[PDB]
Amino acid sequence: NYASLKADTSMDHVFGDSTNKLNYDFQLMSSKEAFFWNYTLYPIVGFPIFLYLYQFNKLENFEAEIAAAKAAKAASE
Amino acid sequence: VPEPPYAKYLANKSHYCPPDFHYSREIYAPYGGYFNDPKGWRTNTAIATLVMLAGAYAVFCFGNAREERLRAPKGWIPSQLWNDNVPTPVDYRGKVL
Amino acid sequence: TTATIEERRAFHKEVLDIVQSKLANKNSEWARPEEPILHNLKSEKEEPHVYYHNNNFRVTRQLIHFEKTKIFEDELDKCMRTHGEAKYRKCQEIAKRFQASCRVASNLERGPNARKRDVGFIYQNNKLRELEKDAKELGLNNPFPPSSPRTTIGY
Amino acid sequence: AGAGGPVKLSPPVDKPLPYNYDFWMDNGIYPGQPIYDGMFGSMVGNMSLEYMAKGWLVLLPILSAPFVYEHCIADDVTRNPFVPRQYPSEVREFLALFKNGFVLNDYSQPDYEEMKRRQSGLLTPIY
Amino acid sequence: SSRIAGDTTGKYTPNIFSPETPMDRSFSHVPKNPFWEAWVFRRDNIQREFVWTWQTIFDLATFVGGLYVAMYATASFCSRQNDKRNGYPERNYYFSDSKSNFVIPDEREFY
Amino acid sequence: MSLYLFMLFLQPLSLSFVSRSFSKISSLMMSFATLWSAVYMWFTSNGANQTFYQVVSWGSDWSTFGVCYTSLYISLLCAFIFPICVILVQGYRALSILICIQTAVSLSIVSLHMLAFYALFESSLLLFFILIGRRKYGSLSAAYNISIYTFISALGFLISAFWLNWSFGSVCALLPNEEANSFVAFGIFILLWVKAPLVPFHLWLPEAHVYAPTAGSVLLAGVLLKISIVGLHVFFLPICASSIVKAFPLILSICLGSFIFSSFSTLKQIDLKKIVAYSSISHMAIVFLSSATNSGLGIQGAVLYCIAHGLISPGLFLLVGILYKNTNTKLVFYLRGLSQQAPVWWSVWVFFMLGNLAFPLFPNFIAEVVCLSALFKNHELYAYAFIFFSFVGTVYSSTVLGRLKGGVSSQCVDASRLDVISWNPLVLATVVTGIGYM
Amino acid sequence: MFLLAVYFLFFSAIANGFFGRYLGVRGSQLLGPSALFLALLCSGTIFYEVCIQGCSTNIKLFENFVYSNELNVSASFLYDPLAATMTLTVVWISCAVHAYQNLYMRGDGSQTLFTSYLSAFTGFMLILVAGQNLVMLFIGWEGIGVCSYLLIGYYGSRVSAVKSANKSLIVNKISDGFLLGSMLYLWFYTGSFSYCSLATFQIPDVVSILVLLGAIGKSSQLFFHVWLADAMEGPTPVSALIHAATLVTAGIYVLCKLNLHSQSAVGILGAATALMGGLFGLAANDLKRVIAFSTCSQLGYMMAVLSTCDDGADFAMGHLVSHAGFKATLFLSAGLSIAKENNNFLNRYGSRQGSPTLSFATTIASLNLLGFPELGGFYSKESILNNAYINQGVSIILTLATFLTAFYTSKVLAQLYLFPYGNGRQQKSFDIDATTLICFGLLLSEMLLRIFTGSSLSQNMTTNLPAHIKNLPFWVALSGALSGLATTNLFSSNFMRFFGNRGGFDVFYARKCSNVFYHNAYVSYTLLDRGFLKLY
Amino acid sequence: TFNYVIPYGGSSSYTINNEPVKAEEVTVDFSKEPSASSLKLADKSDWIAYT
Ligand SMILES: CCCCCCCCCCCCCCCCCC(=O)O[C@@H](COC(=O)CCCCCCCCCCCCCCC)COP(=O)(O)OCC[N+](C)(C)C
Ligand SMILES: CCCCCCCCCCCCCCCCCC(=O)O[C@@H](COC(=O)CCCCCCCCCCCCCCC)COP(=O)(O)OCC[N+](C)(C)C
Ligand SMILES: CCCCCCCCCCCCCCCCCCCC(=O)O[C@H](COC(=O)CCCCCCCCCCCCCC)COP(=O)(O)OCCN
Ligand SMILES: CCCCCCCCCCCCCCCCCCCC(=O)O[C@H](COC(=O)CCCCCCCCCCCCCC)COP(=O)(O)OCCN
Ligand SMILES: CCCCCCCCCCCCCCCCCCCC(=O)O[C@H](COC(=O)CCCCCCCCCCCCCC)COP(=O)(O)OCCN
Numbered sequence A: 001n002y003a004s005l006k007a008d009t010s011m012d013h014v015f016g017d018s019t020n021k022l023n024y025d026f027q028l029m030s031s032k033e034a035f036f037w038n039y040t041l042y043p044i045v046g047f048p049i050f051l052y053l054y055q056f057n058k059l060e061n062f063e064a065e066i067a068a069a070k071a072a073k074a075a076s077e
Numbered sequence B: 001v002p003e004p005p006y007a008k009y010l011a012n013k014s015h016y017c018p019p020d021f022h023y024s025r026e027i028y029a030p031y032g033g034y035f036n037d038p039k040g041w042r043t044n045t046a047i048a049t050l051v052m053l054a055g056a057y058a059v060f061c062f063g064n065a066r067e068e069r070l071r072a073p074k075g076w077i078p079s080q081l082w083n084d085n086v087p088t089p090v091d092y093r094g095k096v097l
Numbered sequence C: 001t002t003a004t005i006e007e008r009r010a011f012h013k014e015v016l017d018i019v020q021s022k023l024a025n026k027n028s029e030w031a032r033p034e035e036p037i038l039h040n041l042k043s044e045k046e047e048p049h050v051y052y053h054n055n056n057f058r059v060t061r062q063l064i065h066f067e068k069t070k071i072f073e074d075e076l077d078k079c080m081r082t083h084g085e086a087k088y089r090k091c092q093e094i095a096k097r098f099q100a101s102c103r104v105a106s107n108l109e110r111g112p113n114a115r116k117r118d119v120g121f122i123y124q125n126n127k128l129r130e131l132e133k134d135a136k137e138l139g140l141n142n143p144f145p146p147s148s149p150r151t152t153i154g155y
Numbered sequence D: 001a002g003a004g005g006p007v008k009l010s011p012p013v014d015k016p017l018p019y020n021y022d023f024w025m026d027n028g029i030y031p032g033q034p035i036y037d038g039m040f041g042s043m044v045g046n047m048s049l050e051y052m053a054k055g056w057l058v059l060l061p062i063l064s065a066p067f068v069y070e071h072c073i074a075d076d077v078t079r080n081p082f083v084p085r086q087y088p089s090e091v092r093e094f095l096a097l098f099k100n101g102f103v104l105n106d107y108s109q110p111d112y113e114e115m116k117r118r119q120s121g122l123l124t125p126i127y
Numbered sequence E: 001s002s003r004i005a006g007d008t009t010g011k012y013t014p015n016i017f018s019p020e021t022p023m024d025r026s027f028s029h030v031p032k033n034p035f036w037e038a039w040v041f042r043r044d045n046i047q048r049e050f051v052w053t054w055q056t057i058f059d060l061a062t063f064v065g066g067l068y069v070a071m072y073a074t075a076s077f078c079s080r081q082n083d084k085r086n087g088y089p090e091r092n093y094y095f096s097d098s099k100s101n102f103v104i105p106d107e108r109e110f111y
Numbered sequence F: 001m002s003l004y005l006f007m008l009f010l011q012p013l014s015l016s017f018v019s020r021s022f023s024k025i026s027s028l029m030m031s032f033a034t035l036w037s038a039v040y041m042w043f044t045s046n047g048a049n050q051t052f053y054q055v056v057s058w059g060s061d062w063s064t065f066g067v068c069y070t071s072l073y074i075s076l077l078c079a080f081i082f083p084i085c086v087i088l089v090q091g092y093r094a095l096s097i098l099i100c101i102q103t104a105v106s107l108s109i110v111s112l113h114m115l116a117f118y119a120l121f122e123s124s125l126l127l128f129f130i131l132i133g134r135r136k137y138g139s140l141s142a143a144y145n146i147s148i149y150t151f152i153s154a155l156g157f158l159i160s161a162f163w164l165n166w167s168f169g170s171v172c173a174l175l176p177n178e179e180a181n182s183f184v185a186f187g188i189f190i191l192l193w194v195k196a197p198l199v200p201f202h203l204w205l206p207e208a209h210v211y212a213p214t215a216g217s218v219l220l221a222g223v224l225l226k227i228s229i230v231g232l233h234v235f236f237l238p239i240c241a242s243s244i245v246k247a248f249p250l251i252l253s254i255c256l257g258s259f260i261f262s263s264f265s266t267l268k269q270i271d272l273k274k275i276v277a278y279s280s281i282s283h284m285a286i287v288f289l290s291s292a293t294n295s296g297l298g299i300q301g302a303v304l305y306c307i308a309h310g311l312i313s314p315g316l317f318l319l320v321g322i323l324y325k326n327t328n329t330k331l332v333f334y335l336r337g338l339s340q341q342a343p344v345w346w347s348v349w350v351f352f353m354l355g356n357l358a359f360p361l362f363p364n365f366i367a368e369v370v371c372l373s374a375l376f377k378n379h380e381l382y383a384y385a386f387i388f389f390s391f392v393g394t395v396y397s398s399t400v401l402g403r404l405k406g407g408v409s410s411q412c413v414d415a416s417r418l419d420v421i422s423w424n425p426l427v428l429a430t431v432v433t434g435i436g437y438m
Numbered sequence G: 001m002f003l004l005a006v007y008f009l010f011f012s013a014i015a016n017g018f019f020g021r022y023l024g025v026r027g028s029q030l031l032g033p034s035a036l037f038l039a040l041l042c043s044g045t046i047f048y049e050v051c052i053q054g055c056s057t058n059i060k061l062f063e064n065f066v067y068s069n070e071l072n073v074s075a076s077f078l079y080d081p082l083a084a085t086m087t088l089t090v091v092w093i094s095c096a097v098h099a100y101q102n103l104y105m106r107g108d109g110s111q112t113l114f115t116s117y118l119s120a121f122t123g124f125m126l127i128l129v130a131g132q133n134l135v136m137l138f139i140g141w142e143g144i145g146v147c148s149y150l151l152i153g154y155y156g157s158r159v160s161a162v163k164s165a166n167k168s169l170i171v172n173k174i175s176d177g178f179l180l181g182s183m184l185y186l187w188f189y190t191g192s193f194s195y196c197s198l199a200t201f202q203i204p205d206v207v208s209i210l211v212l213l214g215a216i217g218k219s220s221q222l223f224f225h226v227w228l229a230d231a232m233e234g235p236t237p238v239s240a241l242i243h244a245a246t247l248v249t250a251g252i253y254v255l256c257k258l259n260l261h262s263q264s265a266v267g268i269l270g271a272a273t274a275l276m277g278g279l280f281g282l283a284a285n286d287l288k289r290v291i292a293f294s295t296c297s298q299l300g301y302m303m304a305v306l307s308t309c310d311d312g313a314d315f316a317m318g319h320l321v322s323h324a325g326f327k328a329t330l331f332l333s334a335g336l337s338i339a340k341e342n343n344n345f346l347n348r349y350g351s352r353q354g355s356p357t358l359s360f361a362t363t364i365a366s367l368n369l370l371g372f373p374e375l376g377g378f379y380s381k382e383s384i385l386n387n388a389y390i391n392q393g394v395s396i397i398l399t400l401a402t403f404l405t406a407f408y409t410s411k412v413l414a415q416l417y418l419f420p421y422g423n424g425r426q427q428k429s430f431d432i433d434a435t436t437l438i439c440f441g442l443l444l445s446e447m448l449l450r451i452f453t454g455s456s457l458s459q460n461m462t463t464n465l466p467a468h469i470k471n472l473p474f475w476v477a478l479s480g481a482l483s484g485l486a487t488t489n490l491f492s493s494n495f496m497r498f499f500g501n502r503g504g505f506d507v508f509y510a511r512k513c514s515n516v517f518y519h520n521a522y523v524s525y526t527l528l529d530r531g532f533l534k535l536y
Numbered sequence H: 001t002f003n004y005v006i007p008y009g010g011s012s013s014y015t016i017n018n019e020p021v022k023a024e025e026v027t028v029d030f031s032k033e034p035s036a037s038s039l040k041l042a043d044k045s046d047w048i049a050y051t
């Protein structure tokens, strides 16, 4: 029925025993560390987004400043 | 364990097979067995070579039909022997050959 | 521009006459029209016969545009392969025409959300030209590059 | 002998399994491994991430020192003892078009300013 | 102790009374392990161990809702840029409060 | 068209008169004959007739049936994949249920009336409740999930159809109507949101696939998920475009979130059918978003990518069903050494997994290229977002393949002659579409 | 005629991998090498026609491979001067490796499947190189990626090998995602996928960054070099092909085909990669790993040279084609050494009676790696170093990289031949047949022909530099070689440990990136859909 | 539209408007208007009174 739970000890002398076990607790990253690393790596992934945002803001600000100077020049003149 | 009846239909261990290596002989794989060397391999290789050359002939016809040279070669090229659409060579100075 | 109900009903009647004229003679190219039904309707969906006919006309036009763009690309490739290192000078015109065909084909039916297709960077180049003109005349300093003579192989 | 070598079989599980046991990769041969080596368990060379970060902190200033001088401290006039390659006007005008060109740094040229602004071009397409 | 069940000739009969175990499709079935089965049961029924904690709320919000907020902001920015690019008037999107009725561009109009 | 509809009605009809021992053979012949009738419908569909290739009405608005580009592709796909379902299923009860389900689904695709679409599509509600909740190998929870989700979404769609029938006077697609109301737009949208598994209304699909039979899973993945795009192109976009353009940032939010979280949820799977089922959910989002752009590229790309999915995911589900027959297990951790033990099964499994990862010689590549091009036409960032997070699919696919590939195993579990006959058509269709005969 | 080579390689792949039962192990051992020999004749004809005689050809197999609305792409092959050179180099190396695998893989079960993988692997490289449009290049790119996945993980019963294959697959997936983004950008704003209409004089920076990010994947540069070292798990014939021509060179070929790169990024990344690869190869103790880190360093040189001058693309390609030869020789000789000694560690190698051909091939390939004067590698490397003097930061780092390269190359040579025997007193042997001799003869002929024919047109063109500047690389290489022979200590134990861990790029990924990845998976599944949204 | 080439739906001109026309000639309403008590309760001016 079920597979046997008894291990094979034929090759222990050749390749070492299985007594030594892992020290891992099999638990994940802490919530606080995860928040920092998500909110750091995900922006790095979305590097085009920030480039587009920067250039669009630059374009709009230059356009608005041109408009303001145009208003100043067209008011007096 | 007494080998099953179908073991007679299964083939032996090849010369290239290491004597210590054991594999299940019943498993079928399209690329071949664990060490192959079938009987009649020479005829199969000859047939494969014939198919390769026939397909090469067909591909050669197709490519020659679709090989477009729009700029003249600087010198004589081997394709002139088999394809007639090669523009007449013109050298670096500009003289036609 | 205002449409009274009387004019709307009159156009409806005239479109019925058009449909009757089309029905008289069989046509295997009925859904591949060469000319649209001209109208001044607010929404083309108001008159169903005009809607479907002009939709078929638009489809035919777009198919023609796609095949034309493929043609232009073929001559552009041939001209590139012929001249050699003189390609940038001699293929400027054909590339210009090919990119114009691409923009026509894409932009006519881009859709509600789709942006304009900037083949050759013409709209960006125009924006930079306007920005430079305004900055120079108003005494501002432009943080953007000046317009370029050529940005692609053609446009 | 490449084929037929003896192997050790990993013992069958005999205790309740942890929820995240999918982090362990075991094909049945004895030395099972984490899904990504270094995620947990023994560390190669007994070196932690802190050690590697400190080593990188030591290296980066020395590695970056050659690059920072030319890119930042140096200027086009003083980078090199010569001007960029001089070309005929027809060739130079075409070559100056390339944003990634090498004639954009010719400070002798009267179009130096426009060439430099071309070199520092747009980050993203405007349209 | 075993026998061949399948017959290519077509004369196949299932020997339910045979002393020898047939080599049927169950012959190759995987033996299975008790603890692996309980791990499978635990992992599927992980909703039993769900507990509302401030850490759980923090994780759910910061990753799921955070990604939704970031995607919505990016999409809104792209829509604004496209409206500036196309030359359209500012479009009346659902949660944007705009005093313009522009929604769908008129194909006939030149923008 | 008329021949196709007649054969669709003939298949359930034949079961009543067959000997109950000839049922499998008659059902297979009927399925192939329906496939041939679909080929005839394609033959009699002229591309000159640009709007609708064919329209037939049988005395009422409800009986109006027609084929367009999307309808024709989806109907040919279902008629192609049905025979494989027929051979996989044994018993008069199972044959009856599957034949009735296929008749209803295939009549839904060609329907041009929203109310008739609703009536035919939801007729297969109890049949899945019984099918997924079968005695020994079924789960009642999954059947409840799928039935309730479908009922609520379809009832919202029905309410919107009633409002349209009251206001316009008609609910047939062939009559041009436009509405700007958001309540009706949401009523039509919710069905698409649920039927095409889109987060957070995707929970029904996994439980259904795992606890459905292999023929049932093949049909569900192959064509029932595609019914969403028939509804979108036929019954939502023509009338509800203003609302999709108004809500496009929200639509992108939901679609890209579904893609990302479905990809991440796939990583936590230990069951092969669940892995394939979650891959399907991540794949649906690109289709939904590409269509929602309402552009020529988007519609074509979505229908193409639906065809690619309906050729790739049925193959994976079929291979997993074959492996489960051979091994009585679906846990990846139990299955090892499959490369050595099943070279022929492993080759096809790797081929189809490469197809699911959208490699160039597969139809998924062409379809994805077109869909990404449509997204790039809308905005660059839209395409960039989808392209990057596609790497998550590679991680879980590679982990599954690596776990299955090697190890120690004492069982020869390789497919028989019947199994190879079962997937040969899918492999041939995948190759033919991959070289560009989309 | 031009199509024939790809046909021969794909026929070898289909024949060996689908009908290998009929052909047999011997049948592969004939059909493979014979088909690649025929492909070598065809590639030689192509090289003479296109490169020497300046006659480019375009072959359109079929049109409308993808035809959706305006989006239109065709399956076409354009053999331009770059493509002919890469095709010749690739076919020459692949024919050599196919000759090599006849005896090396005889002790392996699936030799026919291995030959089939090798031949399809070469075929996809030639598809990438000869494509006329971006989509054909993407097809070849993904084909070589999948073939590398099926070749590195050939030993499925080893967890390390399959995990290495998964690593390669994932990293390459990220890289081609960036490339697909750049492809979409270029189609949108140029109107086509073909390289002819692809030309843009000014391109926005996003496209350049996407192209560079895609290229640094296969051409393993920094932050993307993790897979190359782990790629040692595969059989030796795989390592030779992947490191010599098929995988690593593809990024450089893409960067040279489309000159959309930015000078500032490429030079810094290349110089950093060269220095780091040399430093990593210093610590390594496997024979095979040192050669991979040297491959990384040479890739760094080639990437750096693009920033220097207009001829940088030509210089990079010349170093590419020169590097393929002696690197392939180094892997093949290392693999034979491992088979003869049953060992992978440099400590236990030593002087032992062997074949004169193999030792000479190892010596000459290592001399080309070092920079020994009047050799094919020497010219292609001095063309880079001398022309990089204008970029002061790049030049310094490349000169230190030359020192490190000389040091570990000489250390490997001394440990393999000059050092006393270090292995045990056991019967170990690998007798070499005439086929392996023909393989090494082919490599040696490539090396010798490289000297007479050259690598670039501007190889011997004067760089107007002072003599002490021009001959400096030789002195640095000589000093590195002399220090390597003495086996002196160059760095403290802390930095030696740091370099042995390859900079800890993988440990950072493990501890932060993978844990965040699986915590995102935990939040998505356990907390949300099987948690909050699951009924009792 | 029901085709893969041009976008689905349609567009209406914003410049062009259609004159309203009555649904019927004489309008008879059976829906009563809000009562004064409803308007009083709905009034939120004085928060105490509204509460
Ligand atoms: C268990 C399996 C065992 C059997 C194995 C079978 C082995 C299969 C052999 C592989 C076939 C490779 C051939 C690839 C070319 C695809 C063939 C093809 O598509 O036919 C073309 C004709 O083109 C050809 O014949 C190509 C010639 C093939 C031979 C050329 C040299 C062979 C080298 C292979 C390189 C091909 C790379 C192409 C990458 C896409 C149809 O022409 P059209 O009428 O224009 O069709 C319309 C186009 N579309 C399909 C997109 C709708
Ligand atoms: C471009 C036009 C010409 C196209 C020709 C393509 C070249 C050959 C294409 C043949 C079909 C490609 C898909 C084949 C099935 C995929 C599975 C496979 O390739 O290998 C199978 C089994 O292989 C086969 O039986 C069939 C392979 C025949 C030839 C395969 C050539 C390489 C495939 C080409 C890559 C496909 C490209 C897709 C992306 C462009 C599994 O191999 P492993 O996982 O490594 O395990 C094997 C056992 N061992 C552990 C010992 C290694
Ligand atoms: C030549 C071009 C550049 C090549 C690459 C250079 C990379 C330089 C980045 C490292 C230099 C700055 C490091 C930050 C300062 C930290 C110094 C102390 C480190 C420390 O205390 O915490 C560490 C945090 O990991 C960390 O420090 C991770 C920060 C790394 C930032 C991401 C940059 C990519 C790094 C990839 C290669 C670098 C590998 C080494 C970082 C170990 O954390 P712990 O495990 O003990 O935490 C406990 C688990 N609860
Ligand atoms: C209870 C549940 C919720 C609780 C937890 C929520 C915590 C999350 C909050 C932060 C989320 C990320 C930040 C996005 C929102 C920023 C604030 C919104 C306001 C806003 O739109 O500003 C824009 C943000 O930039 C942008 O356009 C977005 C930039 C950030 C996106 C990229 C970073 C992650 C990349 C990962 C991929 C995700 C996106 C994929 C497409 C720039 O202002 P404006 O110029 O646009 O003018 C618009 C006028 N306000
Ligand atoms: C003016 C009105 C103001 C608002 C008032 C709101 C009042 C509440 C309205 C809720 C209506 C939703 C009806 C669905 C109820 C959830 C299902 C019942 C839960 C349940 O225990 O059902 C079990 C299995 O169901 C399952 O397994 C199904 C799992 C959950 C189904 C998911 C719900 C469908 C999707 C929800 C949203 C869809 C889009 C919404 C627009 C079977 O129970 P039993 O048969 O054994 O009987 C034994 C009795 N304990």
Ligand SMILES: CCCCCCCCCCCCCCCCCCCC(=O)O[C@H](COC(=O)CCCCCCCCCCCCCC)COP(=O)(O)OCCN
Pocket: E093, E094, E095, E096, E097, F156, F159, F160, F163, F181, F182, F183, F184, F185, F186, F187, F188, F189, F243, F244, F247, F250, F251, F254
């Ligand atoms: C919170 C995020 C939103 C979640 C939705 C995500 C994306 C779904 C988009 C689907 C696309 C078409 C659907 C049309 C609109 C649906 C929801 C759009 C967002 C929304 O709620 O806008 C509201 C208007 O819609 C409405 O007034 C009706 C909303 C829908 C009603 C909900 C249930 C209706 C069921 C009816 C059944 C069928 C009935 C048929 C008669 C309020 O926005 P606002 O314009 O007032 O701006 C005020 C801001 N300051």
